[PDB]
Structure formats: C-alpha cells, structure tokens
C-alpha cells in the first residue's frame, strides 16, 4: 500500500529500528559464550527474523532513487559496525509487471536440491527439446502458456525424482519401496542393459546352422567349437526377459506419473476455463474426452495434480448460473459434506506410445523363447535408443508422406507403361530361351505389371535390358522410344526425386536448428527485446539473459510459489499466485525490462 | 637436467604432427625392405595440398554419421538375412551343377556374408543374385522381400550417404560465408556494426584499418613484451599491468574514439 510505506518511512521507525542491531550484535555475542543462554539466543534469532522480513516488506514495489531506497542506505551507514558484527548462488532474481503496470524485481530463495536437479543432463535435454519446439513451431500469443506448462512438468519431474532418490507385512512395504526406487533410478541403465543383451543374443545366433540330420524334417541347432555358446544363449535369454520386465516396471514407476499428471492437468483446465463437459460435451470423436468422462465422479480425480481444490473452483465457476445438484452429480461430490479411477488410469496408460512399445518389446522377448530368432526384432531398438541414429533417421521420416506419394506415383506410371507394353509389346517379354516352354511374362495384366514393377524398377537400365532386343523389327522405332522414356522418367527422375527429398530433409533439419539457435542468441526469451539494445554496455545481453530474465529463475520462482504455504505469501508473491490461478500471463514482461524503464536513473 | 629433457621429449612424442613425420620416416625405412612400401607415401597428398584437404573435409565432417549409417546398414541387412534364412533358404543356390549344390544361406554367418557382400554391392539388391521365385509358393513373399531390400538398403540407405556428403559441402560453404559476413559487417575489437561507421565515406574501412586494427594490437603487445619494463610510460605500464593479471578490460568493447567524441569531431 503506497500510503503505508510512505507513512512508515516518514516516521520514527528508523530511529527505533536502530535499537536492536546494537542489541542483536552485542547481546548475541554475550549470550553465545554461555551455553545456558541458547533459548534466549533462539528468541533473538526469530526476533531478528521478523525484523528482517519487515525490512524486506518495506522494500516492496521499490523505485530506483526512491525515498525509501535512499533512506535505507542512510540507516545502514549509521549502524554499519553493528551490521558487520551481526553478519559474522541461491538468490533468484526475476522481473514482473506488477499491479502498478511498472516493472518490479523479485528476490527469493532457491534450494540446493532444485538447482542440482535443474543441472541434471535429462532436464537439460528436456529444456533443449522444449526450446526447439517453441522456437521452431510456436506462437507468440501462446508461448507463455507453453512455457508455464513446461515449468509445471519440470517441477513434477523434480518432485518424483526427489521422491525416488535413495540416500511379515512390515518388511514387505520397505522391501517393495526400496526395490521400486532402485528400478526407477536405473531405468536407462536397464534399457542399455537390454540393448547390450540384444546384441549378445544376436551375436550368439550368428553361429547357427541347419541340417536334416540330428545335431524332410528340419532341425534348428546351434553349431560351434567352444561348446559354451548354448548355456550363454539360454542364460542370456532368461536374463533378457527379466530385464525387459524390470524395464516395464521402472517405466510404470517413473514415467507414468508424468502422463497421469499431464492428463489430469489438461482435464482440470478444460473443466475450469473451458467448460468442456459443462457446455461443449464432445459427441464421439474426442475419444480422449470420452475416456476422461469416467474419472470426473471419482473421489480422487486429481491424485497427481496439485490442484485438490479444482472441484470447488469449477463449482464456484459454473454452478451459480448452471446449477448445483447437476454439478455435484457430475463431479461425484456431496454438497452437504476406487475401481473406476484405476480403470481410467490403466486406460490412459495403455494408450501411451512408450508403454505400448515397451509392452511390444516384452512380447517379443517372451516369444524369443518359442523361437530364438524372434530376438532379432530387438535390434530395431537401436533406432529408438541412440540419439545419432534418431537424427539420421529423422531425415528419412521428415518427408514420409512425400516418399509414400512418390512411390505411389512410381506405381501409377509403371502401370501406364505396363498398359502400353501389354497392348503393343507382348512379343518381346519372353524370359525362356527354350522353344519347348515359351514363358510369356506379358500375356496377363497382373503378370506384366508384376514383371514391370519388379525388374524394370529394380534394374539399372529399366526394361530394355530385361526383354528382347527390338533390333530388326517393325516396332523398333517405337520400342527405342518406349525403353528410353521408361529409363528417363522412372529410373532417373523418379529415383532422383527420392534422393532430393532426403537431401532437402537434411537441409531443412539443419537450417531449422540454425534458425532456432540464431533466434535464441539474438532475442530474449521472456521479453523479446533484441540483443542490439542490451549490447550498449559490455556483455549486456549475457548479463540480461543470465540474471535479469533467466527462464530457469522463472521456473524456480514458480516452484517456490507452489511449495510455499499460501498464507505466508508476500504482496508480489500473492499477486503472482493469483494471476497463476486465473491463468493470466500478463506479469511476464513483454517488450519491457527493468533497465529499459530506468535508463535515465541507471545512466 | 635429465627430468626436463624427459618431459620435453614426452610432450614431443604426444604431438600428432611429429608422430606423422615419424610414421613417414618408418615407412621410408621399410621401403628399402620392400619397395612397394613407398606407395603409402602417396597418402601424404591428403595432408599436403590445401585443395585435397578441403575436398576431404566434406567426407570427414560427418564421419560419425557415416559410421553410424554403415552400422545401420549392417543391422538392417542382418534383419533381412534373418528373414531370408528362416524362409528363403532354397533360392540361394550359386552352383548350377547338381553334383555340388552350393547353398549360401544354410548358415547364419555364410548368409550374412553373402548378403552384406553381394546384396549391397549389387545394383538391384539381392533379387538379382539369387534364384528367380517365379512359379513358386513364396513368389508373392519374395517379390515383397527383394523390393523392400532394394528400396530400403540400395536406394535410401545409399542416398543417405550422398545426402550427408552434400550437406557437408553446403555446411562448410555457408560457414565460410557466415565468417566472411560477420567479419565485414562488424568490428573485431569493439563489435560496433559497419552501419554506424558508414555515415562518413569509407568510415568502416578507415576504422578497421587504422583505429581498431588487430595487427596494431598484436604489434603493441609485442612492443610491450620486448621493451624494458622500467621505460614503460603511463599507458604502457597500465596495459602491462593489466596483462599481468590477465584482465582484458582495456580492449574497447562497444565503444570507440569517434563514438565518444562525435560532438567534437562533427
Ligand atoms: N530467458 C533466457 N534465459 C536463458 N538464456 C536466454 C534467455 N533469453 C535468451 N537466452 C539466450 O539463450 C542462449 C542459450 O542459453 P544458455 O543459458 O546459454 O543455455 P545453453 O547454452 O543452450 O545450454 P547449457 O548447457 O544450459 S549452457 C544464451 O546465449 C542466452 O543469451
Ligand atoms: N580489427 C580489425 N582488423 C582488421 N580488419 C578488420 C577488423 N575488424 C573488422 N575487420 C574487417 O575484416 C575484413 C577482412 O580483413 P582484412 O584486413 O581486409 O584482411 P583480409 O582481406 O582478410 O586478408 P588480407 O590478405 O590480409 S587483405 C576487412 O574488410 C575489415 O573491414
Ligand atoms: Zn529480456
Ligand atoms: Zn572497432
């Protein structure tokens, strides 16, 4: 409140402020020596804690060269010795647009665990993927919503990672929790172990031979000299199945909670700020909404989302105009005041692509015992495991639609050439030199089309190198046109199109990466002001991005708000929390910053 | 000083260029044992000529990607070997003589070797190296097998290598263009763009060649090094001291003489 701050500043508080620092230093040093004064020491401790929080509260909505700011340093000078005597990386600085439409700076506290989790390599990879996704294909209007959602996902990741971190019914729970946390910690280690076991099993299978005689009926036996390969194969297969099972369990205990949290978050936001099942009521096409209908009335709908008051919020949002009893029936809440939820959660899990892939890996691992060569399908995991192979195959899969369409075009044009050759060139397609059994491969539309699509596309010269030479014939001049047109159009152009598509995919991915990097290094992520503005002072842009508008600082502040009790929020903290509740991202500085507003005072 | 000499020789023996020259000497010595060992000295054209270095830089720019795509080729050919071995053993008869039937897919190692060699080294894949499946139960499966082999291995998995090389050429070329553009649009020392200096005619050229010439900075640093410290002037002593503590604040960053004194100069 502007009035109260200036009333306190223009009073005798500051004279009374220096009545304690003298005490807070000398009396503390007096009481520290005697071990019997610990309780009085702690009383003075929380007394000065209240004092310092009051002083911080006085510096709320501060303006550079303001009356309160200039008055504080005077008091600091008058009692400097007491400050030095009382005194004898974690600070988080962000800038918001406060209720006064003026940029303000907020300082808070960051714990060591949060920073350590932020510097973890997997969190770094998630941040890089999010940055690329937003910069490449994103909108400026919805950039802040995506950023806040990513921050929420990162905070939930931090929470579950901290939960799983490790520093007859009684022992059962302890052993089960320890086992599950051990699996969750080493999910990627188990994935790599499964991949290595796949290579080992395939290498063992590389020593296979087949014979009619025991190691017509065919016997499937592995032949080698050492004699130790079959016990190794047996043990490795029974170990690989167990490893795949452990991988699925670790995925369930590690990555499923993120999916459940995201689903509950989107459902709660749709219920509150959209009225999906209140107004929209999707008919049949939104299968996601159709399956989400079953969780509305569950007693524990927001189990993972930290929004337990979502039912009350949606009630206050809609019931006053829409009705009270129907909302209670829909949400399954008693106004006076869990098989279905488990079914919904399992249905959500079974829709997830990664869980399905792990289930398919387990299925093939099980079937590998029926036939050992089913373990060869696990080498496909190298595509989804290694980043380099993913980036290489991204060039192929970037233009998958175009590749399919050009294959269809190849099929159509070869069908046209088949029609022409079948109607005019049936004689030449004699693949048998024996006059006893003339083998015509173009006396049938299906056979001629198969012959064309197979050999004329699989050959280097087209179809003129697979059929009879038309020299010394009536249709020689027509056949030389036919074969050469086939060559030029199908073999040359219609197979250079595929190579051009792949090369253009490589180029597009490379220039997308370059564009994302250039945009990141030339503009600020939060405010969008270009680096040319900040480069007036030396290292201005670097300092701005790393300290003033660090997105990591914004994530840390949002986590700080989430894990802090709402009753203890300060003015700016309460304002930002309220703006969070209504999902208004106006407090993010857009086009403005602290130094831009106060250039005159800073220069 | 035996220990210092030992350390110096250990440092020398780690250097790549000295090792390359030692290997050249070793092959030169062995060429007397067998004259054809002198053929390995033609590899020196790669490390000698600048043009060959630039040409081979396109190949070596994506060496990791090329190795990884060769490994992917090996894996996919192994998969096709597994399928053909479990279902297409009959067709891999490379001997027409009935007396000695030569099956090249009755063994996993032999079939994998046959695939990796001829099916990748042939223009049509593996359908042009084995028996024609016409008039057979598995004809419709074999035509899918050979054509998938062709499309995936021969076409796509060898166009990936060409695309990698072409993208390497493009990346090197655009890197050179970007370096040139950055050099000609901004000052190396202060970073102020050429648009500021271009108000006066030839302003950027004069600025770079005289006011903020990096050659002049190197000459000044050499002048400080070879001059006696007792004879340093005020600015010389200040710059020498800043050199001692490795503080590069004296380099003008974002500021220059004309920018500060525009009012007096204009
Ligand atoms: N709000 C922002 N927070 C952080 N970096 C920003 C921001 N806006 C722009 N940038 C720029 O983003 C660039 C890359 O971000 P960095 O913080 O350097 O992280 P990084 O280099 O991508 O990867 P690491 O391993 O975390 S250092 C920097 O050069 C910053 O100048
Ligand atoms: N501090 C700097 N010193 C020299 N050139 C600079 C500097 N800052 C920017 N440049 C620009 O760098 C460009 C290339 O440098 P030049 O001095 O012209 O040398 P060069 O053309 O690369 O090769 P040569 O053979 O030495 S002329 C020029 O167009 C300058 O404008
Ligand atoms: Zn900014
Ligand atoms: Zn300059």
């Amino acid at each position: 409140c502007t009035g109260n701050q200036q009333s306190l500043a223009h009073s005798r508080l500051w004279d009374a402020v220096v009545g304690f620092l003298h005490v807070f230093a000398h009396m503390m040093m007096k009481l520290a020596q005697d071990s019997s004064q610990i309780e009085l020491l702690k009383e003075l401790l929380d007394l000065q804690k209240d004092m310092v929080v009051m002083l911080l509260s006085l510096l709320e909505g501060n303006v550079v060269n303001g009356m309160i700011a200039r008055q504080m340093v005077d008091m600091l000078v008058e009692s400097s010795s007491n400050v030095e005597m009382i005194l004898k990386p974690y600070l988080g600085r962000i800038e918001i647009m406060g209720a006064s439409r003026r940029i303000e700076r907020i300082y808070f506290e960051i714990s060591e665990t949060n920073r350590a989790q932020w510097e973890m390599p997997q969190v770094k990879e998630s941040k890089r993927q999010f940055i690329f996704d937003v910069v490449n294909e994103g909108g400026e209007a919805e950039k802040m919503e995506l950023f806040v959602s990513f921050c929420e996902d990162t905070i939930f990741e931090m929470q579950i990672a901290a939960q799983i971190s490790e520093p007859f019914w009684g022992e059962l729970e302890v052993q089960r929790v320890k086992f599950l946390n051990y699996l969750s910690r080493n999910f990627y280690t188990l994935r790599f172990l499964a991949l290595f076991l796949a290579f080992a099993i395939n290498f063992i299978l590389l020593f296979y031979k087949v014979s009619d005689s025991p190691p017509n009926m065919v016997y499937y036996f592995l032949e080698e000299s050492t004699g130790y390969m079959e016990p190794a194969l047996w043990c490795l297969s029974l170990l690989h199945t167990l490893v795949a099972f452990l991988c699925i369990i670790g995925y369930n205990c590690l990555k499923v909670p993120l999916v459940i949290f995201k689903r509950e978050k989107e459902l709660a936001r749709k219920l509150e700020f959209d009225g999906l099942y209140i107004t929209e009521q999707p008919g049949d096409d939104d299968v996601k909404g159709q399956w989400d209908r079953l969780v509305l009335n569950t007693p524990s709908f927001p189990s993972n989302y930290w929004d337990k008051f979502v039912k009350r919020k949606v009630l206050d949002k809609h019931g006053d105009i829409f009705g009270r009893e129907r909302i209670a029936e829909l949400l399954g809440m008693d106004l006076a005041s869990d098989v279905k939820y488990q079914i919904w959660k399992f249905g959500v899990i079974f829709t997830d692509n990664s869980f399905l892939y792990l289930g398919w890996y387990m299925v093939m691992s099980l079937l590998g015992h029926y036939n050992n060569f089913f373990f060869a399908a696990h080498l496909l995991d190298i595509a989804m495991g290694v980043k380099t192979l993913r980036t290489i195959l991204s060039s192929v899969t970037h233009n998958g639609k175009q590749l399919v369409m050009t294959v269809g075009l190849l099929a159509v044009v070869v069908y046209l050439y088949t029609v022409v050759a079948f109607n005019f060139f049936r004689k030449f397609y004699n693949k048998s030199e024996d006059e006893d059994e003339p083998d015509m491969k173009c006396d049938d539309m299906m056979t001629c089309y198969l012959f064309h699509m197979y050999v004329g596309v699989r050959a280097g010269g087209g179809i003129g190198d697979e059929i009879e030479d038309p020299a010394g014939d009536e249709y020689e001049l027509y056949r030389v046109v036919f074969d050469i047109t086939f060559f030029f159009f199908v073999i040359v152009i219609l197979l250079a199109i595929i190579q051009g598509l792949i090369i253009d995919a490589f180029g597009e991915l490379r220039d997308q990466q370059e564009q994302v990097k250039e945009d990141m290094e030339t503009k600020c992520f939060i405010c969008g002001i270009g680096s040319d503005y900040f480069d007036t002072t030396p290292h201005g842009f670097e300092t701005h991005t790393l300290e003033e508008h660090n997105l990591a600082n914004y994530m840390f502040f949002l986590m700080y708000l989430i894990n802090k009790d709402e009753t203890e929020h300060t003015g700016q903290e309460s304002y930002v929390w309220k703006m969070y509740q209504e999902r208004c991202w106006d407090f993010f500085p857009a086009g403005d910053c602290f130094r831009k507003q106060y250039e005159d005072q800073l220069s």
Side-chain angles (χ1 to χ4, degrees), chain A:
Chain A
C1 186
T2 61
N4 289 329
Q5 307 215 327
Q6 66 214 11
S7 294
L8 283 165
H10 273 153
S11 61
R12 278 83 64 195
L13 183 63
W14 310 88
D15 293 78
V17 162
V18 186
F20 298 88
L21 309 170
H22 185 89
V23 174
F24 286 165
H26 308 99
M27 291 325 188
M28 211 156 58
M29 291 305 168
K30 186 176 180 180
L31 302 169
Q33 294 197 21
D34 296 331
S35 291
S36 62
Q37 322 288 340
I38 53 170
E39 52 271 355
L40 193 60
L41 192 83
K42 299 307 182 64
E43 293 175 341
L44 188 153
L45 291 203
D46 57 334
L47 173 62
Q48 66 209 311
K49 175 65 178 178
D50 283 358
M51 181 145 188
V52 298
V53 300
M54 181 256 288
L55 276 296
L56 294 174
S57 179
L58 262 71
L59 259 187
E60 209 163 7
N62 168 66
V63 189
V64 191
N65 310 330
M67 50 216 68
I68 301 168
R70 299 173 312 190
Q71 192 172 265
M72 191 75 78
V73 302
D74 310 329
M75 187 285 268
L76 291 203
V77 169
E78 320 295 349
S79 199
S80 69
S81 67
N82 297 344
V83 176
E84 318 205 333
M85 184 177 177
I86 192 52
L87 276 172
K88 284 332 310 173
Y90 302 154
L91 294 178
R93 316 145 69 98
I94 62 167
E95 296 166 10
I96 64 169
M97 273 150 170
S100 49
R101 314 151 71 260
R102 200 179 63 251
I103 296 294
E104 321 166 330
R105 193 160 284 181
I106 301 188
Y107 307 102
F108 62 97
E109 206 268 346
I110 313 178
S111 78
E112 279 283 30
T113 75
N114 299 343
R115 185 156 288 274
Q117 296 283 338
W118 179 244
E119 317 292 345
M120 291 265 168
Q122 61 266 21
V123 178
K124 283 192 172 299
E125 187 58 39
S126 298
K127 175 181 69 67
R128 290 153 182 152
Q129 191 58 46
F130 157 80
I131 289 304
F132 180 89
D133 285 324
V134 163
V135 173
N136 173 256
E137 51 181 1
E140 271 73 4
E142 281 191 351
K143 176 195 279 184
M144 284 302 120
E145 181 56 282
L146 301 194
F147 176 75
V148 174
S149 71
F150 159 67
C151 292
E152 289 164 323
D153 303 351
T154 309
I155 289 156
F156 188 70
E157 281 315 335
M158 274 155 178
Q159 288 183 16
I160 60 177
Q163 287 173 4
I164 62 170
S165 87
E166 268 292 331
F168 39 83
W169 275 288
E171 188 54 275
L172 188 151
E173 290 303 321
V174 167
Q175 291 287 346
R176 199 212 63 173
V177 174
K178 197 265 168 181
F179 175 76
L180 289 161
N181 284 24
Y182 171 50
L183 262 61
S184 296
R185 256 182 293 110
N186 314 125
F187 175 70
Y188 289 100
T189 299
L190 292 164
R191 292 291 299 158
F192 178 87
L193 178 55
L195 186 57
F196 171 82
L197 284 196
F199 293 104
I201 285 147
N202 296 294
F203 183 90
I204 289 184
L205 295 165
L206 208 51
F207 292 110
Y208 173 106
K209 276 178 63 71
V210 67
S211 279
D212 46 357
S213 64
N216 304 357
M217 65 182 179
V218 287
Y219 286 161
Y220 280 55
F221 74 104
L222 194 146
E223 183 178 1
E224 54 90 16
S225 310
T226 62
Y228 293 131
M229 291 265 148
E230 61 87 20
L233 178 62
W234 187 83
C235 293
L236 282 190
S237 47
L238 282 71
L239 178 48
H240 170 273
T241 315
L242 179 76
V243 161
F245 192 52
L246 295 183
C247 284
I248 287 178
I249 290 179
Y251 176 88
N252 171 24
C253 298
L254 174 68
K255 307 298 306 192
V256 159
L258 187 68
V259 184
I260 295 315
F261 158 81
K262 294 181 75 62
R263 189 84 152 206
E264 289 180 1
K265 185 162 60 66
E266 311 156 69
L267 188 46
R269 271 75 179 275
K270 269 170 214 180
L271 261 189
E272 185 176 355
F273 305 101
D274 189 359
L276 183 64
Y277 307 107
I278 306 312
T279 287
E280 294 294 328
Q281 304 277 355
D284 67 329
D285 283 352
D286 190 359
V287 59
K288 293 172 71 174
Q290 298 290 136
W291 189 249
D292 288 347
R293 294 193 58 90
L294 282 72
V295 67
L296 304 175
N297 67 272
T298 61
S300 68
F301 157 68
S303 197
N304 283 20
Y305 195 23
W306 47 63
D307 216 13
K308 324 297 172 183
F309 294 110
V310 61
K311 293 174 177 295
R312 324 210 69 252
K313 285 156 67 181
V314 68
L315 182 63
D316 300 335
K317 185 72 177 57
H318 286 305
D320 273 318
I321 191 166
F322 189 99
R324 312 297 296 187
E325 49 194 7
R326 217 203 73 170
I327 298 284
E329 211 66 0
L330 178 56
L331 272 298
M333 51 205 308
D334 183 77
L335 295 181
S337 293
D338 204 353
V339 60
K340 208 179 179 185
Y341 177 67
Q342 296 301 328
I343 283 293
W344 171 84
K345 180 159 81 76
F346 283 139
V348 170
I349 293 182
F350 286 166
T351 285
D352 191 59
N353 274 47
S354 295
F355 183 89
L356 283 194
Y357 171 67
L358 297 171
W360 166 91
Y361 189 103
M362 180 47 177
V363 162
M364 311 295 288
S365 190
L366 282 164
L367 279 195
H369 305 275
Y370 194 20
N371 179 28
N372 284 341
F373 275 93
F374 277 131
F375 281 116
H378 299 165
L379 287 183
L380 289 185
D381 192 36
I382 72 176
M384 283 73 74
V386 184
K387 184 142 281 163
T388 309
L389 271 192
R390 282 179 285 177
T391 61
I392 290 193
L393 293 177
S394 165
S395 66
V396 164
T397 67
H398 195 63
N399 300 324
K401 191 180 55 176
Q402 276 93 325
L403 286 179
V404 172
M405 282 296 248
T406 192
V407 162
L409 181 48
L410 174 80
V412 170
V413 299
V414 174
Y415 177 71
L416 288 173
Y417 292 163
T418 311
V419 162
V420 185
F422 183 91
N423 292 277
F424 302 100
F425 304 128
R426 276 194 310 261
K427 167 206 315 184
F428 307 99
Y429 292 74
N430 216 307
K431 300 305 292 178
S432 188
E433 75 290 339
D434 273 8
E435 293 83 3
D436 183 74
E437 321 96 310
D439 193 3
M440 298 316 189
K441 290 218 169 296
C442 202
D443 265 322
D444 191 325
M445 210 70 220
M446 199 86 49
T447 306
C448 201
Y449 193 28
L450 194 46
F451 181 77
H452 271 73
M453 271 315 268
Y454 188 48
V455 300
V457 181
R458 264 191 50 260
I463 205 58
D465 75 313
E466 284 305 290
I467 60 174
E468 168 179 346
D469 189 358
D473 190 14
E474 195 180 30
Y475 283 0
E476 177 191 4
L477 313 159
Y478 295 87
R479 273 282 323 278
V480 293
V481 175
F482 169 75
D483 316 324
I484 293 186
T485 47
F486 185 81
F487 174 71
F488 291 167
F489 292 145
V490 163
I491 295 297
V492 170
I493 293 171
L494 277 168
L495 299 200
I497 282 180
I498 293 186
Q499 306 175 337
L501 281 171
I502 295 181
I503 294 164
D504 178 272
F506 272 124
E508 191 160 345
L509 297 176
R510 188 269 305 279
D511 85 354
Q512 278 187 355
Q513 296 291 338
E514 291 181 351
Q515 188 40 48
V516 176
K517 184 198 68 65
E518 182 65 26
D519 220 344
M520 271 305 288
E521 311 196 300
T522 50
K523 294 182 21 173
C524 192
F525 189 72
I526 306 294
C527 70
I529 304 177
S531 66
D532 80 350
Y533 182 76
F534 303 105
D535 281 321
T536 65
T537 177
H539 304 336
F541 190 70
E542 290 188 10
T543 53
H544 169 84
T545 63
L546 295 174
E547 284 65 41
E548 310 172 21
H549 286 185
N550 220 333
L551 59 93
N553 290 34
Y554 281 91
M555 190 218 78
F556 285 137
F557 176 72
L558 194 152
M559 175 167 187
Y560 180 60
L561 284 183
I562 287 188
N563 64 7
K564 193 174 192 184
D565 193 1
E566 187 189 335
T567 67
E568 320 301 320
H569 285 160
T570 71
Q572 307 159 315
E573 298 176 354
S574 179
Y575 168 77
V576 177
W577 182 243
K578 176 196 173 70
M579 291 265 298
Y580 198 50
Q581 302 292 69
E582 299 96 34
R583 308 291 284 177
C584 182
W585 317 124
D586 283 18
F587 63 98
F588 289 110
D592 291 331
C593 60
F594 187 82
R595 64 174 58 187
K596 162 164 296 186
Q597 265 204 355
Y598 303 70
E599 271 295 0
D600 291 331
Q601 294 85 305
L602 283 178
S603 180

